[PDB]
Short mmCIF file of C-alpha atoms and ligand atoms in Angstrom, two decimals:
data_model
loop_
_atom_site.label_atom_id
_atom_site.label_comp_id
_atom_site.label_asym_id
_atom_site.label_seq_id
_atom_site.Cartn_x
_atom_site.Cartn_y
_atom_site.Cartn_z
CA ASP A 1 1.36 13.01 19.64
CA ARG A 2 1.94 15.89 17.22
CA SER A 3 0.45 19.36 17.45
CA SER A 4 -2.40 20.21 15.05
CA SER A 5 -1.97 22.93 12.45
CA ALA A 6 -4.63 24.56 10.26
CA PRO A 7 -6.53 21.93 8.16
CA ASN A 8 -7.69 21.99 4.53
CA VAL A 9 -11.26 23.28 4.17
CA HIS A 10 -14.03 23.86 1.62
CA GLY B 1 4.85 23.73 -21.69
CA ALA B 2 1.09 23.16 -21.65
CA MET B 3 0.19 25.39 -18.68
CA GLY B 4 1.37 28.62 -20.31
CA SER B 5 -0.72 27.95 -23.44
CA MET B 6 -3.97 27.39 -21.52
CA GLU B 7 -6.28 30.32 -20.72
CA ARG B 8 -6.50 31.33 -17.05
CA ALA B 9 -10.18 30.34 -16.83
CA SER B 10 -9.32 26.89 -18.20
CA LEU B 11 -6.51 26.43 -15.65
CA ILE B 12 -8.89 27.30 -12.80
CA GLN B 13 -11.55 24.92 -14.15
CA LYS B 14 -8.98 22.11 -14.43
CA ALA B 15 -7.75 22.77 -10.88
CA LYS B 16 -11.35 22.27 -9.67
CA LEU B 17 -11.66 19.07 -11.72
CA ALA B 18 -8.37 17.76 -10.32
CA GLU B 19 -9.65 18.51 -6.81
CA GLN B 20 -12.78 16.45 -7.48
CA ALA B 21 -10.59 13.60 -8.80
CA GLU B 22 -8.28 13.85 -5.75
CA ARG B 23 -5.37 14.48 -8.12
CA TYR B 24 -3.51 17.01 -6.00
CA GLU B 25 -0.21 17.07 -7.92
CA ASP B 26 -2.15 17.99 -11.06
CA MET B 27 -4.26 20.49 -9.12
CA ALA B 28 -1.12 22.23 -7.85
CA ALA B 29 0.42 22.40 -11.33
CA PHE B 30 -2.78 23.97 -12.70
CA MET B 31 -2.83 26.54 -9.88
CA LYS B 32 0.86 27.37 -10.45
CA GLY B 33 0.02 28.04 -14.09
CA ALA B 34 -2.90 30.24 -13.02
CA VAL B 35 -0.67 32.22 -10.66
CA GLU B 36 1.81 32.71 -13.50
CA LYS B 37 -0.88 34.54 -15.50
CA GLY B 38 -0.07 37.45 -13.18
CA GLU B 39 -3.54 38.36 -11.86
CA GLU B 40 -4.34 38.41 -8.15
CA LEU B 41 -6.12 35.35 -6.82
CA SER B 42 -9.59 35.50 -5.29
CA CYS B 43 -10.39 33.87 -1.94
CA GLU B 44 -11.73 30.77 -3.71
CA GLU B 45 -8.58 30.62 -5.83
CA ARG B 46 -6.30 31.04 -2.82
CA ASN B 47 -8.11 28.10 -1.28
CA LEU B 48 -7.48 25.98 -4.40
CA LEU B 49 -3.77 26.88 -4.33
CA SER B 50 -3.50 26.09 -0.61
CA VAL B 51 -5.43 22.79 -0.71
CA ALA B 52 -3.42 21.55 -3.69
CA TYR B 53 0.07 22.17 -2.33
CA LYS B 54 -0.86 21.26 1.26
CA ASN B 55 -2.05 17.84 0.06
CA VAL B 56 1.13 17.27 -1.97
CA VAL B 57 3.54 18.24 0.81
CA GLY B 58 1.27 16.51 3.35
CA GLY B 59 1.85 13.17 1.62
CA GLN B 60 5.60 13.79 1.51
CA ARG B 61 5.76 14.81 5.19
CA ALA B 62 3.86 11.67 6.22
CA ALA B 63 6.18 9.49 4.13
CA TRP B 64 9.27 11.23 5.50
CA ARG B 65 8.10 10.69 9.09
CA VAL B 66 7.60 6.96 8.50
CA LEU B 67 11.03 6.57 6.93
CA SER B 68 12.78 8.71 9.55
CA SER B 69 11.23 6.57 12.30
CA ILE B 70 12.45 3.36 10.65
CA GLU B 71 15.88 4.96 10.15
CA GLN B 72 16.14 5.93 13.83
CA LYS B 73 14.99 2.47 14.98
CA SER B 74 17.61 0.89 12.72
CA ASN B 75 20.33 3.18 14.11
CA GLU B 76 19.53 2.14 17.71
CA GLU B 77 22.39 -0.21 18.60
CA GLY B 78 21.37 -3.80 19.34
CA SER B 79 19.02 -3.66 16.35
CA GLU B 80 20.58 -5.51 13.40
CA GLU B 81 21.00 -2.03 11.88
CA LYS B 82 21.40 -3.54 8.44
CA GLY B 83 21.97 -1.38 5.43
CA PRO B 84 22.15 2.02 3.64
CA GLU B 85 18.71 1.60 2.03
CA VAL B 86 16.48 3.42 4.51
CA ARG B 87 18.84 6.41 4.71
CA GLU B 88 19.05 6.61 0.90
CA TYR B 89 15.29 6.40 0.43
CA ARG B 90 14.57 8.87 3.25
CA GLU B 91 16.98 11.26 1.47
CA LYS B 92 15.15 10.76 -1.85
CA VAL B 93 11.76 11.62 -0.30
CA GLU B 94 13.35 14.53 1.60
CA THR B 95 14.76 16.00 -1.62
CA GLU B 96 11.36 15.80 -3.32
CA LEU B 97 9.71 17.50 -0.33
CA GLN B 98 12.30 20.27 -0.40
CA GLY B 99 11.64 20.70 -4.14
CA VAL B 100 7.92 21.28 -3.57
CA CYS B 101 8.58 23.71 -0.72
CA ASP B 102 11.05 25.60 -2.93
CA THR B 103 8.42 25.80 -5.71
CA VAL B 104 5.80 27.25 -3.34
CA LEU B 105 8.25 29.69 -1.77
CA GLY B 106 9.31 30.72 -5.29
CA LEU B 107 5.74 31.50 -6.34
CA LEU B 108 5.16 33.46 -3.14
CA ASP B 109 8.28 35.53 -3.76
CA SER B 110 7.95 35.94 -7.53
CA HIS B 111 4.19 36.57 -7.84
CA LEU B 112 1.98 36.53 -4.76
CA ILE B 113 3.40 38.47 -1.81
CA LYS B 114 4.48 41.70 -3.49
CA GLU B 115 1.31 41.92 -5.64
CA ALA B 116 -1.38 41.58 -2.92
CA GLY B 117 -3.50 44.72 -2.45
CA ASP B 118 -5.38 43.99 0.78
CA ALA B 119 -4.49 42.91 4.33
CA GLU B 120 -6.31 39.57 4.22
CA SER B 121 -4.38 38.39 1.17
CA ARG B 122 -1.04 39.82 2.37
CA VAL B 123 -1.40 37.96 5.68
CA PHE B 124 -2.51 34.76 3.93
CA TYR B 125 0.60 34.69 1.71
CA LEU B 126 3.00 35.59 4.55
CA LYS B 127 1.44 32.81 6.63
CA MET B 128 1.99 30.45 3.70
CA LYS B 129 5.65 31.53 3.50
CA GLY B 130 6.00 30.76 7.22
CA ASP B 131 4.35 27.36 6.74
CA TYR B 132 6.59 26.21 3.90
CA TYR B 133 9.76 27.34 5.71
CA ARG B 134 8.42 25.40 8.71
CA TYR B 135 8.07 22.27 6.55
CA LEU B 136 11.67 22.76 5.40
CA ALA B 137 12.70 23.15 9.05
CA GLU B 138 11.11 19.81 9.96
CA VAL B 139 13.74 18.02 7.84
CA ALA B 140 16.65 20.48 8.11
CA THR B 141 19.85 19.60 10.00
CA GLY B 142 22.83 21.86 10.77
CA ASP B 143 23.49 25.52 9.94
CA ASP B 144 20.96 25.80 7.13
CA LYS B 145 18.36 24.87 9.78
CA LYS B 146 19.01 28.03 11.79
CA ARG B 147 18.52 30.20 8.68
CA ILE B 148 15.32 28.35 7.68
CA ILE B 149 13.88 28.76 11.18
CA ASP B 150 14.71 32.49 11.10
CA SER B 151 12.96 32.81 7.73
CA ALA B 152 9.84 31.09 9.07
CA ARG B 153 9.78 33.27 12.19
CA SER B 154 10.23 36.48 10.16
CA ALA B 155 7.35 35.62 7.81
CA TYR B 156 5.00 34.64 10.62
CA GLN B 157 5.92 37.72 12.67
CA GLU B 158 5.27 40.10 9.76
CA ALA B 159 1.92 38.40 9.17
CA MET B 160 1.08 38.67 12.90
CA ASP B 161 1.92 42.38 12.96
CA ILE B 162 -0.35 43.13 9.98
CA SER B 163 -3.17 40.91 11.24
CA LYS B 164 -3.26 42.63 14.65
CA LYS B 165 -3.46 46.08 13.04
CA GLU B 166 -5.84 45.28 10.22
CA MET B 167 -8.06 42.29 11.01
CA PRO B 168 -10.55 41.29 13.76
CA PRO B 169 -9.34 38.68 16.30
CA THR B 170 -11.86 36.09 15.09
CA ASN B 171 -10.96 36.44 11.39
CA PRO B 172 -10.20 32.90 10.06
CA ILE B 173 -6.90 33.93 8.41
CA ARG B 174 -5.72 35.69 11.59
CA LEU B 175 -6.70 32.57 13.55
CA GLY B 176 -5.07 30.07 11.20
CA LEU B 177 -1.89 32.16 11.27
CA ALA B 178 -1.79 32.29 15.07
CA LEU B 179 -2.47 28.55 15.31
CA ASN B 180 0.37 27.75 12.92
CA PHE B 181 2.79 30.21 14.57
CA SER B 182 2.02 28.57 17.93
CA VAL B 183 2.83 25.18 16.34
CA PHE B 184 6.11 26.66 15.04
CA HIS B 185 6.96 27.76 18.58
CA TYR B 186 6.20 24.36 20.07
CA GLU B 187 7.50 21.93 17.44
CA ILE B 188 10.30 23.89 15.73
CA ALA B 189 11.58 26.71 17.93
CA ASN B 190 11.75 24.81 21.24
CA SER B 191 9.56 27.51 22.81
CA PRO B 192 6.63 25.79 24.63
CA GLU B 193 6.05 28.84 26.86
CA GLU B 194 5.52 31.12 23.87
CA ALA B 195 3.43 28.47 22.08
CA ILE B 196 1.06 28.16 25.04
CA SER B 197 0.93 31.89 25.75
CA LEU B 198 0.15 32.72 22.11
CA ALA B 199 -2.47 29.98 21.79
CA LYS B 200 -4.19 30.98 25.04
CA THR B 201 -4.22 34.70 24.20
CA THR B 202 -5.44 33.97 20.65
CA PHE B 203 -8.25 31.73 21.92
CA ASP B 204 -9.46 34.17 24.57
CA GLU B 205 -9.37 37.26 22.32
CA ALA B 206 -11.15 35.38 19.52
CA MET B 207 -13.90 34.15 21.86
CA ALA B 208 -14.33 37.68 23.25
CA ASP B 209 -15.14 38.97 19.75
CA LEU B 210 -16.90 35.91 18.30
CA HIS B 211 -20.30 37.64 18.52
CA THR B 212 -19.09 40.09 15.82
CA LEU B 213 -17.90 37.46 13.31
CA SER B 214 -19.80 37.08 10.02
CA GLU B 215 -21.77 33.87 9.61
CA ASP B 216 -19.82 32.88 6.48
CA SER B 217 -16.65 32.56 8.63
CA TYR B 218 -18.19 30.92 11.69
CA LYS B 219 -17.47 27.29 10.77
CA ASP B 220 -13.83 27.92 9.89
CA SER B 221 -13.06 30.15 12.89
CA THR B 222 -14.68 27.75 15.37
CA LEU B 223 -12.63 24.88 13.88
CA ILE B 224 -9.37 26.77 14.47
CA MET B 225 -10.46 27.70 18.00
CA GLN B 226 -11.09 23.99 18.72
CA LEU B 227 -7.58 23.16 17.49
CA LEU B 228 -6.12 25.90 19.73
CA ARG B 229 -7.99 24.28 22.65
CA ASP B 230 -6.84 20.76 21.68
CA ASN B 231 -3.20 21.87 21.37
CA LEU B 232 -3.40 23.67 24.73
CA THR B 233 -4.68 20.44 26.33
CA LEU B 234 -1.85 18.46 24.69
CA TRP B 235 0.82 20.99 25.73
CA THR B 236 -0.20 21.38 29.39
CA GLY C 1 16.80 5.73 -12.09
CA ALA C 2 19.91 3.60 -12.70
CA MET C 3 18.25 0.49 -11.22
CA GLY C 4 20.17 -1.95 -13.45
CA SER C 5 23.26 -1.69 -11.25
CA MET C 6 21.40 -1.85 -7.93
CA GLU C 7 21.46 -4.91 -5.69
CA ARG C 8 18.26 -6.89 -6.15
CA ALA C 9 17.95 -7.25 -2.37
CA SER C 10 18.19 -3.45 -2.00
CA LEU C 11 15.41 -2.92 -4.54
CA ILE C 12 13.16 -5.35 -2.64
CA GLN C 13 13.96 -3.66 0.68
CA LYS C 14 13.16 -0.25 -0.80
CA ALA C 15 9.87 -1.59 -2.18
CA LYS C 16 8.92 -2.65 1.36
CA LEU C 17 9.90 0.77 2.74
CA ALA C 18 7.85 2.50 0.03
CA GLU C 19 4.87 0.31 0.96
CA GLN C 20 5.18 1.36 4.61
CA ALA C 21 5.36 5.02 3.52
CA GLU C 22 2.33 4.58 1.22
CA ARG C 23 4.52 5.65 -1.71
CA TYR C 24 3.07 3.31 -4.31
CA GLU C 25 4.56 4.88 -7.45
CA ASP C 26 8.02 4.47 -5.89
CA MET C 27 7.14 0.95 -4.73
CA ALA C 28 6.17 -0.03 -8.28
CA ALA C 29 9.35 1.45 -9.75
CA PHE C 30 11.46 -0.52 -7.25
CA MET C 31 9.62 -3.76 -8.09
CA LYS C 32 10.04 -3.11 -11.84
CA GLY C 33 13.77 -2.76 -11.22
CA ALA C 34 13.75 -6.01 -9.23
CA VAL C 35 11.94 -7.84 -12.02
CA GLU C 36 14.52 -6.50 -14.49
CA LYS C 37 17.30 -8.21 -12.50
CA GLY C 38 16.03 -11.29 -14.36
CA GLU C 39 15.39 -13.76 -11.50
CA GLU C 40 12.03 -15.37 -10.73
CA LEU C 41 9.90 -13.71 -8.05
CA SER C 42 8.91 -15.34 -4.77
CA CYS C 43 5.39 -15.25 -3.35
CA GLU C 44 6.16 -12.26 -1.17
CA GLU C 45 7.72 -10.51 -4.17
CA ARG C 46 4.71 -11.22 -6.40
CA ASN C 47 2.57 -9.66 -3.68
CA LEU C 48 4.77 -6.54 -3.58
CA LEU C 49 4.59 -6.20 -7.38
CA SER C 50 0.81 -6.66 -7.36
CA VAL C 51 0.08 -4.29 -4.44
CA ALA C 52 2.27 -1.56 -5.92
CA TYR C 53 0.83 -1.48 -9.42
CA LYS C 54 -2.75 -2.16 -8.23
CA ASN C 55 -2.53 0.92 -5.97
CA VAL C 56 -1.15 3.10 -8.77
CA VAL C 57 -3.71 2.03 -11.39
CA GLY C 58 -6.43 1.96 -8.71
CA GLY C 59 -5.93 5.69 -8.09
CA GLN C 60 -5.95 6.39 -11.83
CA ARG C 61 -9.11 4.32 -12.40
CA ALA C 62 -10.92 6.14 -9.58
CA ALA C 63 -9.86 9.52 -11.00
CA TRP C 64 -10.86 8.53 -14.53
CA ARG C 65 -14.32 7.43 -13.36
CA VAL C 66 -14.91 10.75 -11.59
CA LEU C 67 -13.86 12.73 -14.65
CA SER C 68 -15.80 10.54 -17.11
CA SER C 69 -18.94 11.04 -15.02
CA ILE C 70 -18.48 14.83 -14.99
CA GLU C 71 -17.76 14.77 -18.74
CA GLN C 72 -20.93 12.84 -19.53
CA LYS C 73 -23.09 14.97 -17.21
CA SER C 74 -21.73 18.12 -18.85
CA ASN C 75 -22.37 16.78 -22.36
CA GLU C 76 -25.93 15.66 -21.45
CA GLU C 77 -26.80 19.14 -20.22
CA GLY C 78 -25.45 20.29 -23.58
CA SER C 79 -24.64 23.92 -22.70
CA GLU C 80 -23.07 25.80 -25.61
CA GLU C 81 -20.08 26.65 -23.39
CA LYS C 82 -19.07 23.70 -21.20
CA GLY C 83 -17.17 20.44 -21.77
CA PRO C 84 -13.73 20.88 -23.48
CA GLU C 85 -11.68 21.22 -20.29
CA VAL C 86 -13.06 18.10 -18.64
CA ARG C 87 -12.63 16.12 -21.87
CA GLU C 88 -8.96 17.18 -22.15
CA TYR C 89 -8.23 16.41 -18.49
CA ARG C 90 -10.02 13.04 -18.66
CA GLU C 91 -7.83 12.28 -21.72
CA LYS C 92 -4.68 13.26 -19.77
CA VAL C 93 -5.52 10.90 -16.89
CA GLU C 94 -6.51 8.19 -19.38
CA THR C 95 -3.15 8.44 -21.15
CA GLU C 96 -1.30 8.07 -17.85
CA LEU C 97 -3.43 5.04 -16.90
CA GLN C 98 -2.75 3.43 -20.28
CA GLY C 99 0.98 4.04 -19.76
CA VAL C 100 1.00 2.19 -16.43
CA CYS C 101 -1.00 -0.71 -17.89
CA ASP C 102 1.42 -0.90 -20.83
CA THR C 103 4.36 -0.99 -18.39
CA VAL C 104 2.84 -3.90 -16.45
CA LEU C 105 1.91 -5.82 -19.59
CA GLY C 106 5.44 -5.22 -20.91
CA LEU C 107 7.04 -6.71 -17.78
CA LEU C 108 4.71 -9.71 -17.94
CA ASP C 109 5.64 -10.33 -21.57
CA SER C 110 9.35 -9.51 -21.37
CA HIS C 111 10.25 -11.17 -18.05
CA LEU C 112 7.56 -12.87 -15.96
CA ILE C 113 5.23 -15.16 -17.93
CA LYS C 114 7.78 -17.05 -20.02
CA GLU C 115 10.24 -17.52 -17.11
CA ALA C 116 7.85 -18.89 -14.42
CA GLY C 117 8.75 -22.43 -13.35
CA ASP C 118 5.55 -23.58 -11.68
CA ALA C 119 1.83 -23.62 -12.46
CA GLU C 120 0.88 -21.44 -9.51
CA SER C 121 3.11 -18.57 -10.61
CA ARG C 122 2.23 -18.99 -14.32
CA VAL C 123 -1.48 -18.70 -13.45
CA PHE C 124 -0.80 -15.66 -11.24
CA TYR C 125 0.93 -13.83 -14.10
CA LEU C 126 -1.67 -14.78 -16.73
CA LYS C 127 -4.37 -13.52 -14.36
CA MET C 128 -2.42 -10.27 -14.03
CA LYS C 129 -2.24 -9.97 -17.84
CA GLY C 130 -6.02 -10.43 -17.99
CA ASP C 131 -6.51 -7.78 -15.30
CA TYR C 132 -4.36 -5.10 -16.96
CA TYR C 133 -6.00 -5.71 -20.36
CA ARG C 134 -9.32 -5.40 -18.51
CA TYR C 135 -8.26 -2.02 -17.10
CA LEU C 136 -7.31 -0.93 -20.64
CA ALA C 137 -10.74 -2.14 -21.80
CA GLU C 138 -12.50 0.05 -19.23
CA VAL C 139 -11.28 3.16 -21.06
CA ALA C 140 -11.05 1.81 -24.62
CA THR C 141 -13.43 2.87 -27.39
CA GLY C 142 -14.36 1.51 -30.83
CA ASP C 143 -12.32 -1.15 -32.66
CA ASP C 144 -9.31 -0.96 -30.35
CA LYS C 145 -11.71 -2.03 -27.59
CA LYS C 146 -12.63 -5.29 -29.32
CA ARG C 147 -8.95 -6.28 -29.62
CA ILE C 148 -8.21 -5.39 -25.99
CA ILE C 149 -11.22 -7.40 -24.80
CA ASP C 150 -10.04 -10.40 -26.84
CA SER C 151 -6.57 -10.11 -25.30
CA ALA C 152 -8.05 -10.07 -21.78
CA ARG C 153 -10.29 -13.07 -22.51
CA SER C 154 -7.41 -15.08 -24.01
CA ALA C 155 -5.18 -14.47 -20.98
CA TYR C 156 -7.93 -15.32 -18.49
CA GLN C 157 -8.95 -18.44 -20.42
CA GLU C 158 -5.37 -19.76 -20.52
CA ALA C 159 -5.06 -19.11 -16.79
CA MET C 160 -8.37 -20.88 -16.12
CA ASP C 161 -7.33 -23.92 -18.15
CA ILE C 162 -4.07 -24.34 -16.24
CA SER C 163 -5.65 -23.66 -12.83
CA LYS C 164 -8.31 -26.34 -13.30
CA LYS C 165 -5.68 -28.95 -14.24
CA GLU C 166 -3.04 -27.98 -11.70
CA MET C 167 -4.48 -26.31 -8.61
CA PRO C 168 -7.15 -27.12 -5.97
CA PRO C 169 -10.47 -25.21 -6.22
CA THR C 170 -9.75 -23.41 -2.92
CA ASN C 171 -6.31 -22.13 -3.96
CA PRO C 172 -6.29 -18.30 -3.47
CA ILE C 173 -4.79 -17.64 -6.92
CA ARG C 174 -7.34 -19.91 -8.64
CA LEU C 175 -10.12 -18.17 -6.69
CA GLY C 176 -8.89 -14.63 -7.38
CA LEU C 177 -8.61 -15.52 -11.07
CA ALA C 178 -12.16 -16.89 -11.24
CA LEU C 179 -13.52 -13.85 -9.40
CA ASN C 180 -11.80 -11.45 -11.80
CA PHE C 181 -12.80 -13.41 -14.93
CA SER C 182 -16.41 -13.33 -13.72
CA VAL C 183 -16.10 -9.53 -13.33
CA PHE C 184 -14.70 -9.36 -16.88
CA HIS C 185 -17.75 -11.26 -18.14
CA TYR C 186 -20.20 -8.99 -16.35
CA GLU C 187 -18.67 -5.54 -16.64
CA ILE C 188 -16.62 -5.75 -19.87
CA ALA C 189 -17.94 -8.51 -22.13
CA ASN C 190 -21.65 -7.84 -21.47
CA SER C 191 -22.10 -11.53 -20.64
CA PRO C 192 -24.09 -11.66 -17.36
CA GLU C 193 -25.05 -15.32 -17.82
CA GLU C 194 -21.43 -16.44 -18.03
CA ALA C 195 -20.47 -14.17 -15.13
CA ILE C 196 -23.15 -15.67 -12.89
CA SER C 197 -22.48 -19.25 -13.98
CA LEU C 198 -18.73 -18.96 -13.36
CA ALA C 199 -19.19 -17.21 -10.00
CA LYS C 200 -21.75 -19.78 -8.83
CA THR C 201 -19.64 -22.78 -9.91
CA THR C 202 -16.50 -21.28 -8.35
CA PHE C 203 -18.26 -20.56 -5.06
CA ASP C 204 -19.90 -23.99 -4.81
CA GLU C 205 -16.75 -25.97 -5.67
CA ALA C 206 -14.68 -23.95 -3.20
CA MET C 207 -17.27 -24.48 -0.44
CA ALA C 208 -17.33 -28.23 -1.20
CA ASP C 209 -13.58 -28.46 -0.51
CA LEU C 210 -13.38 -25.84 2.26
CA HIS C 211 -12.71 -28.54 4.88
CA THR C 212 -9.34 -29.24 3.19
CA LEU C 213 -8.08 -25.62 3.22
CA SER C 214 -4.82 -24.98 5.09
CA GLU C 215 -5.16 -22.31 7.78
CA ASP C 216 -2.35 -20.37 6.05
CA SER C 217 -4.61 -19.50 3.09
CA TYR C 218 -8.00 -19.80 4.81
CA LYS C 219 -8.39 -16.04 5.32
CA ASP C 220 -7.62 -15.14 1.71
CA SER C 221 -9.73 -17.88 0.13
CA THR C 222 -12.79 -17.18 2.31
CA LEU C 223 -12.52 -13.46 1.49
CA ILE C 224 -12.69 -14.22 -2.25
CA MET C 225 -15.63 -16.55 -1.65
CA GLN C 226 -17.43 -13.68 0.13
CA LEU C 227 -16.81 -11.38 -2.85
CA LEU C 228 -18.19 -14.06 -5.20
CA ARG C 229 -21.29 -14.17 -2.97
CA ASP C 230 -21.56 -10.35 -2.90
CA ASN C 231 -21.31 -10.14 -6.69
CA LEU C 232 -23.89 -12.91 -7.11
CA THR C 233 -26.28 -10.94 -4.87
CA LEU C 234 -25.62 -7.77 -6.89
CA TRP C 235 -26.09 -9.55 -10.24
CA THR C 236 -29.33 -11.37 -9.36
CA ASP D 1 -22.36 0.27 -7.91
CA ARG D 2 -19.67 -1.86 -9.55
CA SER D 3 -18.72 -5.51 -9.17
CA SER D 4 -15.97 -6.40 -6.70
CA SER D 5 -12.66 -7.78 -7.96
CA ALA D 6 -9.90 -9.36 -5.89
CA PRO D 7 -8.43 -6.91 -3.29
CA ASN D 8 -4.89 -6.17 -2.11
CA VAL D 9 -3.66 -8.31 0.79
CA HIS D 10 -0.56 -8.29 2.99
C1 WPN E 1 -10.56 34.70 1.65
C2 WPN E 1 -9.37 33.75 1.52
O1 WPN E 1 -8.26 34.27 1.35
N1 WPN E 1 -9.55 32.43 1.60
C3 WPN E 1 -8.49 31.42 1.46
C4 WPN E 1 -7.69 31.00 2.69
C5 WPN E 1 -7.48 29.50 2.70
C6 WPN E 1 -7.02 28.91 4.03
N2 WPN E 1 -6.65 29.95 5.00
S1 WPN E 1 -5.90 29.42 6.36
O2 WPN E 1 -4.83 28.56 5.95
O3 WPN E 1 -5.61 30.58 7.15
C7 WPN E 1 -7.12 28.48 7.20
C8 WPN E 1 -7.99 29.09 8.09
C9 WPN E 1 -9.00 28.35 8.69
C10 WPN E 1 -9.13 27.01 8.39
BR1 WPN E 1 -10.52 25.97 9.16
C11 WPN E 1 -8.27 26.40 7.50
C12 WPN E 1 -7.27 27.14 6.90
C13 WPN E 1 -7.75 30.90 5.24
C14 WPN E 1 -8.20 31.62 3.99
C1 WPN E 2 2.39 -17.35 -3.43
C2 WPN E 2 2.03 -16.15 -4.31
O1 WPN E 2 2.29 -16.22 -5.52
N1 WPN E 2 1.47 -15.08 -3.75
C3 WPN E 2 1.21 -13.82 -4.44
C4 WPN E 2 -0.16 -13.61 -5.09
C5 WPN E 2 -0.62 -12.17 -4.93
C6 WPN E 2 -2.12 -11.97 -5.05
N2 WPN E 2 -2.77 -13.12 -5.71
S1 WPN E 2 -4.28 -12.84 -6.28
O2 WPN E 2 -4.20 -11.61 -7.01
O3 WPN E 2 -4.71 -14.03 -6.96
C7 WPN E 2 -5.29 -12.64 -4.85
C8 WPN E 2 -5.88 -13.74 -4.28
C9 WPN E 2 -6.62 -13.61 -3.11
C10 WPN E 2 -6.76 -12.36 -2.54
BR1 WPN E 2 -7.77 -12.15 -0.94
C11 WPN E 2 -6.17 -11.25 -3.11
C12 WPN E 2 -5.42 -11.39 -4.26
C13 WPN E 2 -2.60 -14.37 -4.95
C14 WPN E 2 -1.14 -14.73 -4.75
CL1 CL E 3 16.37 5.58 -3.05
CL1 CL E 4 -5.26 18.74 -19.19
MG1 MG E 5 -3.83 33.64 -21.79
MG1 MG E 6 21.29 -8.67 14.86
MG1 MG E 7 19.11 15.86 2.80
MG1 MG E 8 25.73 -8.25 -6.03
MG1 MG E 9 -26.88 26.48 -19.54
MG1 MG E 10 -7.48 8.41 -25.29
MG1 MG E 11 -0.17 -28.56 -8.61
#
C-alpha cells in the first residue's frame, strides 16, 4: 500500500 | 496561440468551466495562460492551477504504475516474457509524464517562485516544485535520479525553513508541505526514520495549536492531520 | 504515429495495455492503426475498438452536456455581461467531439462495413455507424441536423433489416442495436411511440426465446433486456 | 434523466 500525499480540495 | 490572445479574466473563467466539465488538460492549459499574464495568483487561482496539473499528472502516474507492474511481471523469468510492447508503451507514457512535470517546473521557475510577495505563496510554490521533482523521481533511473532527488529535497527544505519561521503549525499549506516531504522521505529517499519522525512531530505540533486555527482552514488542516495519522499507522 | 509499419499483433497488444491503464485515447489510436492494417476484426477486436472510442466520446459527451447546461442557464438569466466564454468553450469541446465521431465514421466507411464477411459483424458496424451519427445529432443544429438524423436512421434501419433476417432475437448485437435505435427514436427523432413500440417488441421477443440463450451470451443479453425495461419504465 | 443505451462490456 502506498503512502498518502496531499489531496485535491475545493 | 489562443491562450495569449484571451484576456486574463476569460482564462480564469474558462479554467473554472473546464473544472466543472472534468476537463483537466484544458483546465491546466487555461491556468498556464493565466500565469503567463504575469500577475500573481490569488489563493483561489493557486487552487485552480494545482487541481488542474495534479489531475493531469495523477492520471499519468496511475497509468505508469499499471504498465510498470505488467512490465515487471513479464520480466520475471518463467513468465512467457513475450515482447517489447509493454516496455515501449511504458516509455511513451513516461515521456508524456516527464513533459508535464517539466512544464510545471518551468512555470514555477519562470513566473511563480521569484514573483511571490508573501510567505504563504512562496511556500506553496516551493512545495509544488518539490512535488513535481518527486513525480520525476518516481520514474527516474540512474544518475539523473540522484540529481532529481536532490532538487526535490532542496525545494522541500527551503519551503520547510520558511514555513517554520513564518506560518503557524496548523496552517494548511505548512501541513500539506510537511505531509508531502514525509512521503518523499518514505517513498523516494529511503528514509523511513525521518518520514516517521517528521510526520509525528508535525501531527503533534499541529494538534497543540489547533485551537488557534481559523475556521476557514479547519476542514483542510484536519484532513491533512488524518493523512499524517494514516501514514504513521501504515509505516509503523 | 507511424502505425502503418507496426505489427498488427503489437497494435492489438498495446490496445489491451492501454485499456488496463485506462488510457482510452491511446487505446483508440492503437485500434485505428490495427483497422488500417486492412484485415477483418475478430469479436475481441471489435470489443476493443468499441470500448476505446465509446470511452473517448463518452467523456466528450458528458463534458458537452455540462457546458451546454451552464450556457443555457447563463443565457436564461440574461445578464448583460455573462455568456461568451462558456459558448466558446462549449464550441471547442463540440468540435473535438465531432472530430472523433468523424474519425469513427471514416473507419467504418473506409475499412469496416464493406469488408465484413458475416451478418453478425455487418450488423455490428452498421449499428456503430448509427450510434456515431446519433452522437453527432446530439450537438447538431438547424439543417445539418436533419441530414445527420437521416444518416443515423438509415444506418440503424439497414442493421435492423439484416438482424431480423439473419440473427436470433436474443443475440447481444441484435439486442444492443434495438436498444440504441429505440433511444434514437425517443431522444433524437422525437418519436416516443416508435421508441416504446420497438423497445416493447424487442423485450417480449427476447424473453420468449430466453430459454434458448447460450450461457456464453446470457449475461450480456439479459443486461440489455434490463435496460429496455428501465427505458420503458422511464418513458411510460 | 436520459435514456440508457448499450454499455461497455469486457
Ligand atoms: C491560499 C492558497 O494558497 N490556497 C491554495 C493552496 C492549494 C493546495 N495547497 S496544498 O497543496 O498545500 C494542500 C493543503 C491541504 C489540503 Br486538504 C490539500 C492541499 C494549500 C493551499
Ligand atoms: C462477437 C462480437 O462481434 N463482439 C463485439 C461486439 C461489441 C459490443 N456489441 S454491442 O455494442 O452490440 C453490445 C451488446 C451488448 C452489450 Br451488454 C454491450 C454492447 C456486441 C458485440
Ligand atoms: Cl508505444
Ligand atoms: Cl475556448
Ligand atoms: Mg490581455
Ligand atoms: Mg511460456
Ligand atoms: Mg525513459
Ligand atoms: Mg509482419
Ligand atoms: Mg445580473
Ligand atoms: Mg459547432
Ligand atoms: Mg445467421
